[PDB]
Structure 1
Amino acid sequence: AQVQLRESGPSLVKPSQTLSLTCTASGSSLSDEAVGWVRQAPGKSLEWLGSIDTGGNTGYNPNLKTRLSITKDNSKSQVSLSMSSVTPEDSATYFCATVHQETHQTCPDGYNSGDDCGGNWDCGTLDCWRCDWGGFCRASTDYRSVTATYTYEWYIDTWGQGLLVTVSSASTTAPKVYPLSSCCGDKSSSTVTLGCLVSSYMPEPVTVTWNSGALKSGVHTFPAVLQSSGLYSLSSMVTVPGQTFTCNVAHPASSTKVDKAVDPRC
């Protein structure tokens, strides 16, 4: 299996710069797929950006067309989006996605389409046809016809993960990561609740794992709070029976990663 998509790019961009994101597809059965881009701003709905199909042809949200450029490199299974002159209004989660885009010939009620004419033949050349004169239609001229209208179909098949992009002048602050233990509130507990405090960072997001992904069950990573310092903090905790324990904290905007050792002794 199944196509999977992964967005990559900066989590923070300064106003007036170009935002450049990459979409990498993996695991498709197919040689190529049409790929679109959609964003969701805080408290807004979803908004279409544009797409590139397997023939290299692009289409854009007309509102954003003059600021957008979508390109591809199929040899890397990648599609790129660039959006010029960003402002804080362009802060959003950006998704890439596979898209189905198709133009349909629509006919009035009572009219057939297709080359399946029924003892009848040569209906294929007509968009919208009826063989209704009273007997067999051996030629295209024996059929009643009208010109079809065109109906456009668009939908998303598979969605990416989503990349959070903040457009802001604000400086980055890498988190300070502190180890936590609930031990001292209940030293005879059968289990120990460990944690990490990811203190005082900007902008979002951070990612937390435990033991490089080996510890997943029992992990609870909490949404961040925006503090009076003007910085964010969040915490992550994991409960373990009464072995090294390490929280793995990445803050993409600052290119920092901290793997913090937490003592499970109690």
Structure 2
Amino acid sequence: VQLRESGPSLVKPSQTLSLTCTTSGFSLSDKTVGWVRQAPGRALEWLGSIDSSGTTGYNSDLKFRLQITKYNSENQVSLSLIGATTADSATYYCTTVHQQTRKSCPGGYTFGYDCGFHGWGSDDCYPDCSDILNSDVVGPIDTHEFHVDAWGQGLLVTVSSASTKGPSVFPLAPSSKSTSGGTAALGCLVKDYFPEPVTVSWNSGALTSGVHTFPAVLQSSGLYSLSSVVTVPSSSLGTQTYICNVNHKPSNTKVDKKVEPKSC
């Protein structure tokens, strides 16, 4: 399964944060779909889930703000969180989960059903099958079973009153003084965007060895910037074209910047 989160990257304080989870093909009608989030530097936090039958379960601490809905016909599950605050800024993941309460009997006991008791007492635990009204009957042990089976990639959602801004992309060109013998560094500077995040590839993914995209810095203006760098053979600088592909999904922007070596 491959789960996909979609929705706005930016939410104003007190407005409602909404997301949708879709697949790349697999059906979600027979699976339980849940939402997990992680704020920067904080722990994973469970939000809630909805099972195949449409029953929902929420994190107690957030039950009053959350709503999860299923749309079998669109193969979609949605999430809504009312009253957004900066504490709700986070990466939001949709998941498929294993969720069930397993009943078992203590050692040496047997379920009423396995004793022939198919009506009253079929779900109780008996030390033997002598009497449906056995006074030594006991209730089953409940094991609440939870785990995440599949994880989406996550969608970062920022809560802020500042406005979206797409990035300006500038080349970090290699120069005669800046090589390292057989290899040369070249890059792209991705300036002044909001909110996060930006991702960067090189030559549309055909160049992956040597690539590093740095974390963003937050400037005094409230706008982020980052850089991406790749190491390539110095001999290829006059002949091979190098392009950085910058993706800024919060503004629906993609930029392909050709990075030309300097004459210097």
Change (3 A) 1:232 1:25: same
Determine if the alignment matches structure 1 residue 13 to structure 2 residue 11.
yes
Give the counterpart of 1:176 among 168, 182, 190. Answer: 168
The answer to which of 222-231 and 191-200 deviates more is 222-231
Equivalent residues of 2:32, 2:50 under 8 A apart: yes
Give the counterpart of 2:148 among 124, 144, 156. Answer: 156
Equivalent residue, structure 2, for 1:236: 228
CA distance in 1, matches of 2:256, 2:64: 43
Counterpart of 1:44 in 2: which secondary structure? coil
Equivalent residues of 2:173, 2:262 under 8 A apart: no
Equivalent residue, structure 2, for 1:222: 214
CA distance in 2, matches of 1:204, 1:42: 12
Determine if the alignment matches structure 1 residue 248 to structure 2 residue 258.
no
Equivalent residue, structure 1, for 2:103: 105
Residue 152 of structure 1 and its aligned partner are, at CA, apart by: 2.4
Determine if the alignment matches structure 1 residue 192 to structure 2 residue 184.
yes
Equivalent residues of 1:126, 1:140 under 8 A apart: no
Residue 172 of structure 1 and its aligned partner are, at CA, apart by: 2.4
Equivalent residue, structure 2, for 1:69: 67
Change (3 A) 1:126 1:200: closer
Equivalent residue, structure 2, for 1:134: none
CA distance in 1, matches of 2:225, 2:44: 27
CA distance in 1, matches of 2:232, 2:99: 49
Unaligned runs of 5+ in 1: 132-136
Corresponding residue pairs, total? 255
Unaligned runs of 5+ in 2: none
The answer to which of 31-40 and 101-110 deviates more is 101-110
Equivalent residue, structure 1, for 2:204: 212
Equivalent residues of 1:19, 1:83 under 8 A apart: yes
Give the counterpart of 1:56 among 23, 30, 54. Answer: 54
CA deviation map 1:88-128 (0-9, x unaligned): 1111111111111112224445423485x5xxx51562421
Equivalent residue, structure 1, for 2:124: 127
Counterpart of 1:48 in 2: which secondary structure? strand
CA distance in 2, matches of 1:62, 1:205: 30
Counterpart of 2:176 in 1: which secondary structure? helix
CA distance in 1, matches of 2:180, 2:146: 60
Equivalent residues of 2:176, 2:262 under 8 A apart: no
Equivalent residues of 2:14, 2:83 under 8 A apart: yes
Change (3 A) 1:175 1:111: same
Residue 44 of structure 1 and its aligned partner are, at CA, apart by: 2.3
Which amino acid counterpart does residue 261 of structure 1 have in structure 2? K
CA distance in 2, matches of 1:265, 1:159: 44
Change (3 A) 1:29 1:183: same
Which amino acid counterpart does residue 185 of structure 1 have in structure 2? K
User: Equivalent pairs: percent with the same residue?
Assistant: 64
Q: TM-score, normalised by structure 2?
A: 0.85
CA deviation map 1:11-39 (0-9, x unaligned): 11111211111111235487531000011
